[PDB]
Each structure stands twice: as C-alpha cells, then as structure tokens.
C-alpha cells in the first residue's frame, strides 16, 4: 500500500510480479523464458532429465549410422536401360 | 452494479424475442422476455446483449409457480462466435440462461454444463454455484 503511495497511485503503479520468486541465483531476476521456437513449444520439451535422453538418442543414432540405415537390372547394362526409357517416353508423348 | 468489474465488450447474440435454455433444477426450462440492462437507445435497433449480461425473462416452460413471473438473470452460454482478447474465437453448443436476483445472487444453487469465463469473473455467485468453467 505505502510503496504504491510512494511510487504512484493505484492505477499507475506497475507491480513486479517477480522480486518475490525463489531461485538458485538472484542475478537472473530479470530473465524471460522462451515460449515458442521454430514450430515447437519449450514447455513441452522442458524436462530436468533431457540431456541423458538426448545422450541415449545420440547413442542410437550413432549405432544406426554404423549400421546400414542411412544408405542397372540384370539383362540390361545401363545404356540399354536408358534407351528403353527414352523410347517409352517418346511412345507416351 | 451487483457485478464485479467493468463494462467489457464481447459480441451480441441474443436479441429480444429469443428463447434460451435453463439447465439448473430450480424448475425452469426456458427464458424469453424483453429487457437488457445497460442497453443503448437507438431508433429501430434491438436490445441484444451478452458478456455475462443481465436480462429480464420469463419461464415459457417450467413450473407454474414461477411461470407468469418476470425475473432478472444472466447469460452463461451464447453459441455466437465471441472473441477472447487472448487469441482465439470461442463459441458454445447452445444458449444458456440462468436465473438470479438483481444483486447477482442465484435462486438456484448449482449449475449444469460449462459457464463462460468472463461471465464467472464478472458474477461471483455464478462462479461459486458453477462446478464447470469453460
């Protein structure tokens, strides 16, 4: 009430909803949390244990990269195949 | 007066001569009659309002003890396309009605179905009698 009286009256005084909050570090009082990134929302991806699940994800991806995951017909050599292809394209046109 | 807060603007859906639903078990089924409080005065224009707006009404269907009797109360659902000042347009399944005294206090004691966010914020006893907001 009196801090209001000091700064400015009821309809002018902008209270900081912060300054009451309880944190590990106090120097970060005037920070902001990002809400939206490219398409996603931060609140959905934000867990305390995300770096470990990301480590597991990277382990899995590196296993697949070593595996065969990211990787002519007999009778016709290659130019025969191209000849057949161009003849068929000509026929359709 | 009776309401807590300012005259805020949300689109109009309910002109005079509109029968809307009551789902509480005070006894009524329907609400019709004329009047809207805080309505303007313009030639040829209908009194029509919402925003948890208070209106005069009669029971067209219900118990005879409260038929034939004019009464005030408040819109809680509209079914027109209203805009929230926080993003999206809202609209309900239907119109809904329900009953009170001029101070905003209800004749009934509980509400069925959803009630509008701004209607409950404007009328306290609706928020106490409502179990379902939005």
């Amino acid at each position: 009430r009196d801090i209001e009286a000091e700064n400015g009256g009821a309809g002018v005084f902008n209270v900081n909803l912060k300054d009451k909050y309880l944190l590990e570090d106090d120097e970060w009082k005037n920070d902001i949390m990002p809400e939206i990134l490219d398409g996603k929302n931060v609140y959905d991806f934000l867990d305390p244990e995300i770096a470990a699940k990301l480590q597991a994800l990277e382990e899995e991806e590196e296993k697949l990269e070593n595996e065969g995951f990211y990787n002519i017909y007999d009778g016709f050599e290659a130019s025969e195949v191209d000849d057949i292809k161009e003849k068929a394209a000509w026929i359709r046109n | 007066n009776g309401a807590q807060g300012t005259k805020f603007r949300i689109s109009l859906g309910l002109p005079v001569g509109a029968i809307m639903n009551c789902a509480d078990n005070s006894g009524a089924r329907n609400l019709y009659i004329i009047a809207v409080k805080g309505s303007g005065s313009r030639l040829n224009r209908l009194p029509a309002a919402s925003l948890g707006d208070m209106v005069m009404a009669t029971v067209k269907k219900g118990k005879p003890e409260l038929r034939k009797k004019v009464m005030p109360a408040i819109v809680v659902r509209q079914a027109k396309s209203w805009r929230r000042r926080d993003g999206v347009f809202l609209y309900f399944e239907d119109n809904a009605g329900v009953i009170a005294n001029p101070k905003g206090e209800m004749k009934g004691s509980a509400i069925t179905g959803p009630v509008g966010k701004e209607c409950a914020d404007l009328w306290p006893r609706v928020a106490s009698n409502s179990g379902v907001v939005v």
Binding site: N41, L46, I50, I91 | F92
Partner: protein, 148 residues
C-alpha cells in the same frame, strides 16, 4: 502463447487463427481453419480423409512411433527455472528436429524403393508392345541426322 493442434488436420493453430468449439462435456475442439471446422460440423471421419495426419499415421505413411516423438510430452508438474536447463533444451530441440527429419526421409525411402524396377518394367512392356512406332522413330532420327 501456445501452439495447439487442429482436431482434424493435426496442424498448428497459432494465436489469432482458427475457431474453437466448446462442447457440453467442457471439451475444446480448435481448428486451423473453416475447412476443418465445417468438416467437423458435417461429421466427417478424419481417419478416412487423405489430407490429414491421422489417416497417414494409421495407414503407414510417415512414421508414428519413434524415440524422437516422445520429447514433446505435455508437462503438468513444473520445475524451478534454471536458465542453464533452458539453454540446454533450446539446443536439444534443434538437434532432435534434424534427427527426426532424417529418420522421416529414411522411412519415405523405405516406402518408395521398388518403384524404379516397376517403371523400367513398364517401359520394357511398352517398347516390346509397340514396335511400329519405333520404325517411325528410327526413320525420323535418320532423316534428321542426314538433314544436319
């Protein structure tokens, strides 16, 4: 601010976009546009319409289950706001999107392999079908090369 998903198209519904409908069960149905809204009104089945994501995921198009798709869980129990944790999440999201996009491209490759064999067999049947046009092709090529 939030980014909701259309009840029909499973598409993002940004602020100031779309319409919301509030059923009597106190349940919200928000749509990306009047197309999906009107389909809902007409009581169409989005699992039968080919331009949704539900049809795709149910049919076996672009994949439904993966480790990449578990991170966007909704969270009803919050945390103390560590900005270090925020910064880690910001990089994590970008990395996860690359990984998911690569796996999606791989799924599409797995689906669309076996098409060039079919196309080649089509062309083989056609050319072995229709030789009488190949004579017109031969004579016209010869005429042109003798012309030039």
């Amino acid at each position: 601010m939030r980014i909701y998903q259309c009840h029909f198209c499973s598409s993002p519904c940004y602020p100031g976009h779309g319409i919301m409908f509030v059923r009597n069960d106190a349940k919200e149905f928000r749509f990306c546009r009047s197309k999906c809204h009107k389909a809902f009104k007409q009581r169409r089945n989005p699992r039968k319409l080919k331009w949704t994501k539900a049809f795709r995921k149910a049919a076996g198009k672009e994949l439904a289950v993966d480790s990449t798709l578990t991170f966007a869980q909704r969270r009803n129990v919050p945390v103390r706001y560590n900005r270090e944790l925020v910064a880690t999440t910001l990089k994590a999201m970008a990395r996860i999107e690359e990984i998911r996009q690569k796996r999606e491209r791989a799924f599409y490759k797995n689906r669309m392999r076996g098409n060039k064999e079919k196309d080649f067999l089509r062309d083989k049947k056609l050319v072995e079908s229709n030789p009488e046009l190949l004579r017109i092709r031969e004579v016209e090529i010869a005429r042109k090369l003798a012309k030039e």
